[PDB]
Motif scaffolding. Sequence first.
Motif, PDB file in Angstrom:
ATOM      1  N   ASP A 148       0.963  -1.346  -0.099  1.00  0.00           N
ATOM      2  CA  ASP A 148      -0.029  -0.009   0.046  1.00  0.00           C
ATOM      3  C   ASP A 148       0.712   1.164  -0.145  1.00  0.00           C
ATOM      4  O   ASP A 148       0.395   2.116  -0.693  1.00  0.00           O
ATOM      5  CB  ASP A 148      -0.811   0.031   1.217  1.00  0.00           C
ATOM      6  CG  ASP A 148      -2.256  -0.926   0.936  1.00  0.00           C
ATOM      7  OD1 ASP A 148      -2.178  -1.817  -0.055  1.00  0.00           O
ATOM      8  OD2 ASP A 148      -3.228  -0.705   1.639  1.00  0.00           O
ATOM      9  N   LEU A 165       0.673   1.329  12.411  1.00  0.00           N
ATOM     10  CA  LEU A 165       0.983   0.447  11.620  1.00  0.00           C
ATOM     11  C   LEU A 165       2.187  -0.396  12.228  1.00  0.00           C
ATOM     12  O   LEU A 165       3.075  -0.881  11.465  1.00  0.00           O
ATOM     13  CB  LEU A 165       1.834   1.387  10.524  1.00  0.00           C
ATOM     14  CG  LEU A 165       0.898   2.353   9.675  1.00  0.00           C
ATOM     15  CD1 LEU A 165       1.581   3.214   8.807  1.00  0.00           C
ATOM     16  CD2 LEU A 165       0.012   1.313   8.628  1.00  0.00           C
ATOM     17  N   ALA A 183       0.895  -2.352   4.622  1.00  0.00           N
ATOM     18  CA  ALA A 183       0.417  -3.644   3.849  1.00  0.00           C
ATOM     19  C   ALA A 183       1.256  -4.192   2.918  1.00  0.00           C
ATOM     20  O   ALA A 183       1.000  -4.201   1.671  1.00  0.00           O
ATOM     21  CB  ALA A 183      -1.033  -3.131   3.414  1.00  0.00           C
ATOM     22  N   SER A 184       2.533  -4.687   3.376  1.00  0.00           N
ATOM     23  CA  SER A 184       3.552  -5.156   2.341  1.00  0.00           C
ATOM     24  C   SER A 184       3.142  -6.581   1.899  1.00  0.00           C
ATOM     25  O   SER A 184       3.188  -7.502   2.788  1.00  0.00           O
ATOM     26  CB  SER A 184       4.798  -5.104   3.002  1.00  0.00           C
ATOM     27  OG  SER A 184       5.691  -5.522   2.054  1.00  0.00           O
ATOM     28  N   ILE A 185       3.200  -6.784   0.695  1.00  0.00           N
ATOM     29  CA  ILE A 185       2.965  -8.130  -0.017  1.00  0.00           C
ATOM     30  C   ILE A 185       4.561  -8.630   0.167  1.00  0.00           C
ATOM     31  O   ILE A 185       5.348  -8.058  -0.536  1.00  0.00           O
ATOM     32  CB  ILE A 185       2.024  -8.080  -1.247  1.00  0.00           C
ATOM     33  CG1 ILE A 185       2.614  -9.330  -2.001  1.00  0.00           C
ATOM     34  CG2 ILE A 185       2.683  -6.880  -2.238  1.00  0.00           C
ATOM     35  CD1 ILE A 185       1.938  -9.531  -3.499  1.00  0.00           C
ATOM     36  N   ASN A 186       4.621  -9.650   1.107  1.00  0.00           N
ATOM     37  CA  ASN A 186       6.007 -10.019   1.120  1.00  0.00           C
ATOM     38  C   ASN A 186       6.148 -11.388   0.604  1.00  0.00           C
ATOM     39  O   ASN A 186       6.423 -12.521   1.506  1.00  0.00           O
ATOM     40  CB  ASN A 186       6.423  -9.985   2.767  1.00  0.00           C
ATOM     41  CG  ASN A 186       7.784 -10.036   2.875  1.00  0.00           C
ATOM     42  OD1 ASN A 186       8.669  -9.467   2.128  1.00  0.00           O
ATOM     43  ND2 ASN A 186       8.325 -10.425   4.129  1.00  0.00           N
ATOM     44  N   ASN A 187       6.098 -11.622  -0.739  1.00  0.00           N
ATOM     45  CA  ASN A 187       6.791 -12.784  -1.162  1.00  0.00           C
ATOM     46  C   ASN A 187       8.179 -13.041  -1.986  1.00  0.00           C
ATOM     47  O   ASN A 187       8.943 -12.101  -1.361  1.00  0.00           O
ATOM     48  CB  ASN A 187       5.817 -13.198  -2.463  1.00  0.00           C
ATOM     49  CG  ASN A 187       5.585 -11.831  -3.632  1.00  0.00           C
ATOM     50  OD1 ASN A 187       6.716 -11.207  -3.622  1.00  0.00           O
ATOM     51  ND2 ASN A 187       4.330 -11.791  -4.204  1.00  0.00           N
ATOM     52  N   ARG A 191      10.786  -9.133  -1.725  1.00  0.00           N
ATOM     53  CA  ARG A 191      11.072  -9.455  -0.369  1.00  0.00           C
ATOM     54  C   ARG A 191      11.399  -7.980   0.211  1.00  0.00           C
ATOM     55  O   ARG A 191      12.303  -7.195   0.094  1.00  0.00           O
ATOM     56  CB  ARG A 191      12.341 -10.256  -0.368  1.00  0.00           C
ATOM     57  CG  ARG A 191      12.665 -10.984   1.166  1.00  0.00           C
ATOM     58  CD  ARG A 191      11.272 -11.886   1.506  1.00  0.00           C
ATOM     59  NE  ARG A 191      11.228 -12.999   0.652  1.00  0.00           N
ATOM     60  CZ  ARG A 191      10.450 -13.997   0.658  1.00  0.00           C
ATOM     61  NH1 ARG A 191       9.320 -13.815   1.594  1.00  0.00           N
ATOM     62  NH2 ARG A 191      10.489 -14.837   0.008  1.00  0.00           N
ATOM     63  N   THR A 192      10.902  -7.693   1.342  1.00  0.00           N
ATOM     64  CA  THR A 192      11.072  -6.657   2.362  1.00  0.00           C
ATOM     65  C   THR A 192      11.521  -7.043   3.778  1.00  0.00           C
ATOM     66  O   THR A 192      11.362  -8.076   4.068  1.00  0.00           O
ATOM     67  CB  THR A 192       9.687  -5.802   2.418  1.00  0.00           C
ATOM     68  OG1 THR A 192       8.718  -6.521   2.844  1.00  0.00           O
ATOM     69  CG2 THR A 192       9.502  -5.334   0.917  1.00  0.00           C
ATOM     70  N   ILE A 193      11.869  -5.831   4.442  1.00  0.00           N
ATOM     71  CA  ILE A 193      12.443  -6.178   5.552  1.00  0.00           C
ATOM     72  C   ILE A 193      11.438  -6.530   6.788  1.00  0.00           C
ATOM     73  O   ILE A 193      11.821  -7.002   7.802  1.00  0.00           O
ATOM     74  CB  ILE A 193      13.447  -5.020   6.109  1.00  0.00           C
ATOM     75  CG1 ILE A 193      14.416  -5.496   7.452  1.00  0.00           C
ATOM     76  CG2 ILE A 193      12.625  -3.865   6.384  1.00  0.00           C
ATOM     77  CD1 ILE A 193      15.239  -6.560   6.957  1.00  0.00           C
ATOM     78  N   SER A 195      10.467  -5.580   9.237  1.00  0.00           N
ATOM     79  CA  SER A 195      10.623  -4.517  10.529  1.00  0.00           C
ATOM     80  C   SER A 195      10.720  -3.154  10.413  1.00  0.00           C
ATOM     81  O   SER A 195      11.101  -2.902   9.440  1.00  0.00           O
ATOM     82  CB  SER A 195      12.130  -4.997  11.155  1.00  0.00           C
ATOM     83  OG  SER A 195      11.867  -6.440  11.477  1.00  0.00           O
TER      84      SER A 195
END
Lengths: 261, 250, 263, 263
Positions: A148, A165, A183-187, A191-193, A195
């Motif tokens: 988002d 958040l 609202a990170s889509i983390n696939n 790939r996001t941190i 934290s």
Amino acid sequence: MKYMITSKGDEKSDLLRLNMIAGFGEYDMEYDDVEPEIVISIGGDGTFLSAFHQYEERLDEIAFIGIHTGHLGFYADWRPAEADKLVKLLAKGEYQKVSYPLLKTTVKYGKKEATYLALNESTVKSSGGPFVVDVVINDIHFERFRGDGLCMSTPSGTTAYNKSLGGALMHPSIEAMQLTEMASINNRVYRTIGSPLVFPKHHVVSLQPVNDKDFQISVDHLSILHRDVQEIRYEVSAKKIHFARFRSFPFWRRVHDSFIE
Amino acid sequence: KYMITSKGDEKSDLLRLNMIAGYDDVEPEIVISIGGDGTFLSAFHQYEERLDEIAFIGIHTGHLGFYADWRPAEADKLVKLLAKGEYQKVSYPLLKTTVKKEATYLALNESTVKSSGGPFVVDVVINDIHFERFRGDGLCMSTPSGTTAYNKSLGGALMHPSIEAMQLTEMASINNRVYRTIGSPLVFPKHHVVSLQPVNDKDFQISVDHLSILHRDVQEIRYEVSAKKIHFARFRSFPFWRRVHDSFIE
Amino acid sequence: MKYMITSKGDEKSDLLRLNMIAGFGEYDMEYDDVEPEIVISIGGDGTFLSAFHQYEERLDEIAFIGIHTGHLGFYADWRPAEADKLVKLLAKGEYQKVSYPLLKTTVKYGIKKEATYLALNESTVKSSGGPFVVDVVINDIHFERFRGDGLCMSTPSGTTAYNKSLGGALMHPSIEAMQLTEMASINNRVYRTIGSPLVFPKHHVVSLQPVNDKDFQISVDHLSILHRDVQEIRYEVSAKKIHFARFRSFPFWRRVHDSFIED
Amino acid sequence: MKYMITSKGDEKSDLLRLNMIAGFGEYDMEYDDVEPEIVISIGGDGTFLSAFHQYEERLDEIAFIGIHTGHLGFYADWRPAEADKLVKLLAKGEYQKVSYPLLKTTVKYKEATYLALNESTVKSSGGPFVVDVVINDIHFERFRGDGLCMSTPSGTTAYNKSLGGALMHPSIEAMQLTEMASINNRVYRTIGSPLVFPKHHVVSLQPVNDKDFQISVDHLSILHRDVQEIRYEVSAKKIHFARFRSFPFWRRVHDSFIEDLEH
Ligand SMILES: Nc1ncnc2c1nc(SCC(=O)NCCc1ccccc1)n2[C@@H]1O[C@H](CO)[C@@H](O)[C@H]1O
Ligand SMILES: Nc1ncnc2c1nc(SCC(=O)NCCc1ccccc1)n2[C@@H]1O[C@H](CO)[C@@H](O)[C@H]1O
Ligand SMILES: Nc1ncnc2c1nc(SCC(=O)NCCc1ccccc1)n2[C@@H]1O[C@H](CO)[C@@H](O)[C@H]1O
Ligand SMILES: Nc1ncnc2c1nc(SCC(=O)NCCc1ccccc1)n2[C@@H]1O[C@H](CO)[C@@H](O)[C@H]1O
């Protein structure tokens, strides 16, 4: 000295405003909204935010005071029942100065560049579709974010949008900024941190476009669409917001009275 | 004056001998650990009483660590640089942990408090002022460099080690009507003291980095940013956020 | 039997569609985009959603099939290279039907009348502009007063979508349920919320009632429209289900694994 | 009929226990501790759990009742002031039954089987906790952290909630797996999101290096040597509750986490 008072607009704040201004009719205090030395906000933190941006050019010569006619705020931490005591203490001059850090937001295009100061935070979201940016930390690529949006918060702003958040709370004496994911889509592809990231002074967090170059950029309460965005840089501002300290209201107590009670 | 600590395996001990050829274990100015972050922690606790006179260097024989920053093969040029004395020192904040005569501890990563069998209930006191009554598994107080460790797994924020602060995170807080907690991680600056005061059970499992000791008859646990710092010998430039990137982002 | 094919729009999907139509022509099949028994989506999950809503008045008489021309999707199971075998297996009628639950969304106003919406992924409610404050009422009983960005109610199959990013649990689509997740709740003493995602069974009704502002931005599978003068927003597991034509065996947890862990 | 009462052990629960026993003496109620038809628990949820495990061999013919002497519990939802009403209501025989799902925990090293009312957790018996998560005979992820928690529906309001898991209504026959302080780096990639499994789904936990795991069931934490497989699945066994008045699950959630204005 020169002062002015902003109001939320409702009967509670407008009447309290007029009552306080009348209080300054017994002391050597001149009303001025062009070059005030003291700015009093009445209403809520949102009202206080408007008062901050109204005088973000004279921050060094203005001590801000917040009064909440509703529930307790982290900026408007004075009760209307103490409005009388404030006028007298303010008219005398028996007050110290406390400073909080601010967030500098720089937006480059493909013209010139625009800079903004935030008291709470600055967020970047999409203009409709999926929000995809590269996060560059100190000219070094860190992650490709998809979701988002992202939120860069001031220390005093950590108790606001940042907290909702899942961000951490920071004591405003700490000169820093905090980046949280929205609202990170983390696939595997993105790939996001995950934290929240807390950055010190002189660190620059650069947000760079990937596909779409139109972004919804918000600064505290205000939000506008920026087209043809080339870069969105975040760093702790060298400018500070100055508060008038009369009593002792600890930051952590204010956190306790808001979320714990 | 320098000294070298080894993990225990054949490779680290061999590299220790291969580096010692290019020594004061009582009055060192340079401490070089060989192994990993865990091995580095041991070298830190071995010299807590002279951190203002020691610079640390980590060598990872295994995976890249947040403290062990040098590769095993890069030990050749490391000696010639540490002998010329041409290096700048980088300082990281530390966490002081007092238990209550009284016992004080120093942590490079974090310190945690859990119950030694049964529910963990504690009053969180911030600067002599009650903040919340906690009930759950426990609490974790992390150094800035420790944020990438247990702190991160507990949902804590990552903060740059140049920031002098400590971070409190929850461990499975029940967070109900009786024990309303903040939920959010809390970051405290210098001179801020977080106090943990028992409600009934006074036996707690207190861990400091790798050391998890059991404490009985505990009346108070005080947390604050230590006045001491740990110094690193810096030759190349390895950004903290790069180490974070390489570790988690891949 | 009667069928139709929707396309993502790129050259790849358009090409594959034409080839499948010609392939189907060699069998007892008829193209009909009005009353199909089989609907085939070629592109991605987003393309599948459009196809779903295009025929949401005929969900009882339609078996959907999804083909992903790009990355693997949770709705688009089949690879483009398998379109050949897919045509043949369809023509023979060699397939069984699998059903996923759907989410019903009812919007009540002040009296224009009433509106209902079916969701395949989720349904969200946010403010039109300003603070979003609603009372969450569960089965006629007040539960919490929410302040924040909004609320998201997800279907089981929708849990791998927006729900997941919001911290919602992943739920196997064989379970007839719906999951409510918070969207940046302030969660203070005034607006105390549960925090945890809530999984409701069938026949449970979640009512979102306005506290002050009666205007809301309501989104159903990224179809976000502004609803004014809203009196109530009701959530419940629908009696209607979407039907999938099944040929092989592609476990839900493997779709999850291939999409988030490793493929 | 045949009944029995378990007590927390303190002065308040012991007294209330004796008081009810005296009351039942006035009716056709036989006290039996080896073959009860109705088991009453006085204390807390912890006391209720002990009562469950004490008679887990005869869950087929036992209806449970919980009385909380302290704060409101999810199993002990009767308050001591309503003790007089309960005795009369039990003696009258006017009550329906409510059944909650249970978790079957199988440990393979000879085969050990456990039933959980709340949850079953697998931590490390010293050293790093690394296991392979297998769902229905196929690898899903390799987990590293403090441990994993498999929760019953009624157990979701317990340890599961504190771990960030979703709250699930006990009418749903399922089980929920949550992570406990996982490491998400370049080596260990986990799903993060809590997972909700339906019936007939098996979740197997297989060792990577260490074979000694500290397994807990509701809080009987036991060290298990040389473990080859830990199997999780929704049990066919169910716990039965005696229902007299309407006390909704969501109300119990509300009154415990949100607020309880009349107390
Ligand atoms: N952050 C999300 N992470 C996963 N999935 C999402 C998300 N956001 C959405 S839609 C809500 C929205 O406007 N989000 C901001 C823009 C965006 C960002 C990513 C993907 C789509 C759109 N969906 C899913 O996109 C589907 C629309 O095709 C919806 O049904 C959501 O499930
Ligand atoms: N969920 C939040 N929890 C805490 N605080 C927030 C949040 N959201 C915001 S602004 C983001 C936004 O537009 N959200 C849509 C609904 C909304 C909700 C609250 C206030 C304004 C608008 N702020 C704070 O509101 C301030 C403006 O008065 C901003 O500076 C945020 O800190
Ligand atoms: N943080 C938890 N929040 C809610 N509930 C929990 C938790 N932890 C547990 S058991 C795990 C454990 O031993 N934790 C050590 C500290 C602790 C703290 C509170 C209660 C019990 C134990 N249960 C529930 O305790 C029940 C035993 O009476 C178990 O069934 C867990 O659901
Ligand atoms: N879940 C955690 N995610 C990240 N890091 C953790 C975690 N947990 C711990 S300690 C609690 C525990 O059960 N740890 C097993 C993992 C471990 C890691 C390194 C060395 C020994 C053992 N630490 C870090 O382990 C360091 C010991 O080397 C401690 O300083 C923790 O920060």
